[PDB]
C-alpha cells in the first residue's frame, strides 16, 4: 500500500549492477532510506536521501524523483556478500515513524569459471547405514527443485565462499531413510547439467 | 532571562470621520516575555468586544500583537489603550489622538 | 508548508 | 553502545504473557516496536516520541507498551495467540537513522509437548570428491527440532570458522501441511583435500537449540527439551 | 520583486496550568496565511488568507499533522532546556523558533533560515551556508553536537533550498492577486505647536503594501538622520501598513522642511511641504 517494492527474488550476476526500486503514495513525504537486512539479522541503514538527485557511497547509489514518487538503490560491481533483503523506508507527511516496504530479496550469483557438476555420496561419521547426497560445483544458472516425494528432503542451492582461495561453489543436499533412495536418482526432479558426474 | 517593555501605538484603521464605521487599534510591540494585558477604553470603561492578532515576533525575537474593535468615532467620546506587563510598575494608558 | 524535521534540542 | 533487546528467542504457550525488554543508552527521544513475518516487511506495532508518550502503529491489536523513562520501551504480550508468532524488532532514533535491536524470535505453541531438540549428524567427505576436485565437503544435518530456534556453527580445532561454510537460510519442514511441523537444517563446510587429509584436524558441527527453561512443568516420558548444544565431530584422516 | 516565506513558533510553559501554550503563524511576505493555537477549539491548522482556503483536505491534514508534531517536539524541548540550565518547573520559560526561505524576482532561492531563542536570547541558528550551526553557549553546543552526529543539516537544507521554495512558488501563483500587488502610500502632513517658538511636522504614509518604506525629512535639502522621530511601521488591520516621521521645527520656518516618501508602489519618490 503506502510503500511498494517488488519482493523478488532479484537474481543478479556477480559484477553486474543490482537495481532496487521503490514507490510511495504520500506526495509530501520528506525522508527516504534504504535498509539492508541479512538473513536472520536486523535491518541496518545504508543510504539516506532527502532532495531530488543522486547520492553515491562507495558501490551504492541512491536516487530520488519526488515528482514521480520513485526512489532507487543501485549496487555497482555486485558481490555474493551483497545477497540480502533491501527495504525501502519512507517517512510520510507529519509522521514520526518510518513506513517500510515489504523488501526485495537480492541474490548475487557467483560466476563459476570452471563448472564441474557432480553428485557425491557422504557417509555418517558415527558408523551406520546413514548417508546424504551432495550436488555440487554446478554453474549458477542451474535451479534445484523441491522433492516430489515427502520422505525425500532436498535443500535449496547454497553459495559457499572458500575465502583463502577466493573460490565460490554452489551445492544442494538430499537425504531420505527410504531404503530405495539413491544419489543416482536424488535430483531427478531437477533440470541438472547433461555432463553431471556420478561416481558409483 | 531578558525582559523588554512594550512600545504602544493607538490609532484608527482608516482616517477618523464622525459617524463613519471604523476600527480602533492598539499595537503593542518590542516586548518580552509574551504575557501581556491589553484593554481598549471608551471614556475609561473597558470595551468587551476586543479581538487580537495571532502572537508573532520580530527579527530581535520581541513580540507584537494588534488589539482591535469596530467603533464609530463621535466628537466627544475619548478612546485609549491600557497595557500591563511584568516590566511595568503601573498600567500604561495611551490616549487615542485622532489629529496626531 | 511546514518543515518535517524530527530533531529535538 | 546501541539498542539492547532481550530475549533473542522465546517459546510461549497459547494464553501466556511475556515482556520483551528494550533499552538504549543514546538518549534517543524516539523508540519503536515492529514485527516481521517470514519473507515479509516490517509493520509498526507502537511508537514513542518521548518519556510518557506512546501511540498506536499499523498492527497494535494484542500488545501494550510503556515509556516511563527515556532509556526503556518494554513491549508486553498479554495473551499469546498463534497469529503473534513473528520476529519483533525494537528501534530508536534521534531524527534520521533508526537503530535496530537484535530482534526477538517468538513462537506461540498450542502444547509444550510439541517442543523437540535437534539430532545432529556429520557426514564425511566422499573419496570421489577428493580425487575429482582436491576438495573435501563435510555436511552437518540437524533434524527433528521445533521450534526453529537454532544457531548452527562449525568449529575447526576449537576455533569457530566462517570461511568455507554455507548453512541453509531456512529449514525444511518435515511435515509441510502442519503449523507445528518439526524442522531439518543442513550446513556444509568445504576445505582443501590436504587440510582434511591432515589427521591433526578436528571438525565439529554445533547446534545451539533455544527450548524450555528450568521453571516449566514437564510431564512427558522423554527428556525435557531445554536450551542445550547438540554436536557431531569428525577427525581428519589419510 | 523578491519574496519570502516564514513560520514563527512560540512555546510558553505555564506552571500548574497544564500543557505549555503553543502558537504557530505562517507568512508570505508581509501577509499572514495560517495559524495554529494550542488553546483554540479546532486543534487544526487554520487559514488566515482567502487564497490558502483553495487548498484541499490533503494539504490541511498534512499541515495539521506537522504543526501538532512541532507542538510535541517543543513541549519536550522546554523540559530539555530546564535540564540544561538547572531551572525548576516553578518558572515560566519561552522557546521561539523561526524558519523559511527567500527567493529573488526570478523566484530562485536566495537564502534559508532556521533559528531558535530561549527566554528572548539567541540559542542556535543554521549558518547562511546551510552546512553548519552557530551555538550561543554550552547548552546550545550540546544541541549542535547531537544535530551533527545525526546529520540533521542535510535534511534541513533539503527543505530550505528545495521544498520551502516549491511551497512559496505555489502560494505566489495561487495568491497572485493578494501577494503580487503593491499598494502605494496615501500621504499627508500634520502641524502642532509644542512651544510658542516651535512646532511638530508629521509626515504620514497610510494604506501601503508591502511594509518596506523609507520616510526621510530634509532641512534645506540635508538629511535629518539625527533629528527625526520615526515610529515603527504598524499594521492597519486590513492587510496594509502605516508609518509616520516627525521633526520639531522653528515656528514660522515650517516651509524650509521637506518629507520624502520612497515605496515600490510609487512610480517616483514623493516630496511633501507643510501647506497651512
TrEMBL record, chain E:
<feature type="disulfide bond">
    <location>
        <begin position="101"/>
        <end position="164"/>
    </location>
</feature>
<dbReference type="GO" id="GO:0006955">
    <property type="term" value="P:immune response"/>
</dbReference>
<dbReference type="GO" id="GO:0031901">
    <property type="term" value="C:early endosome membrane"/>
</dbReference>
<dbReference type="GO" id="GO:0098553">
    <property type="term" value="C:lumenal side of endoplasmic reticulum membrane"/>
</dbReference>
<feature type="disulfide bond">
    <location>
        <begin position="203"/>
        <end position="259"/>
    </location>
</feature>
<dbReference type="GO" id="GO:0042612">
    <property type="term" value="C:MHC class I protein complex"/>
</dbReference>
<keyword id="KW-0490">MHC I</keyword>
<keyword id="KW-0732">Signal</keyword>
<protein>
    <submittedName>
        <fullName>MHC class I antigen</fullName>
    </submittedName>
</protein>
<dbReference type="GO" id="GO:0000139">
    <property type="term" value="C:Golgi membrane"/>
</dbReference>
<comment type="similarity">
    <text>Belongs to the MHC class I family.</text>
</comment>
<dbReference type="GO" id="GO:0030670">
    <property type="term" value="C:phagocytic vesicle membrane"/>
</dbReference>
<dbReference type="GO" id="GO:0002474">
    <property type="term" value="P:antigen processing and presentation of peptide antigen via MHC class I"/>
</dbReference>
<keyword id="KW-0325">Glycoprotein</keyword>
<feature type="binding site">
    <location>
        <position position="151"/>
    </location>
    <ligand>
        <name>Zn(2+)</name>
    </ligand>
</feature>
<keyword id="KW-0479">Metal-binding</keyword>
<dbReference type="GO" id="GO:0012507">
    <property type="term" value="C:ER to Golgi transport vesicle membrane"/>
</dbReference>
<dbReference type="GO" id="GO:0009986">
    <property type="term" value="C:cell surface"/>
</dbReference>
<feature type="domain" description="Ig-like">
    <location>
        <begin position="185"/>
        <end position="271"/>
    </location>
</feature>
<dbReference type="GO" id="GO:0055038">
    <property type="term" value="C:recycling endosome membrane"/>
</dbReference>
<keyword id="KW-1133">Transmembrane helix</keyword>
<keyword id="KW-1015">Disulfide bond</keyword>
<keyword id="KW-0472">Membrane</keyword>
<keyword id="KW-0391">Immunity</keyword>
<dbReference type="GO" id="GO:0046872">
    <property type="term" value="F:metal ion binding"/>
</dbReference>
<feature type="binding site">
    <location>
        <position position="154"/>
    </location>
    <ligand>
        <name>Zn(2+)</name>
    </ligand>
</feature>
<keyword id="KW-0812">Transmembrane</keyword>
<keyword id="KW-0597">Phosphoprotein</keyword>
<keyword id="KW-0862">Zinc</keyword>
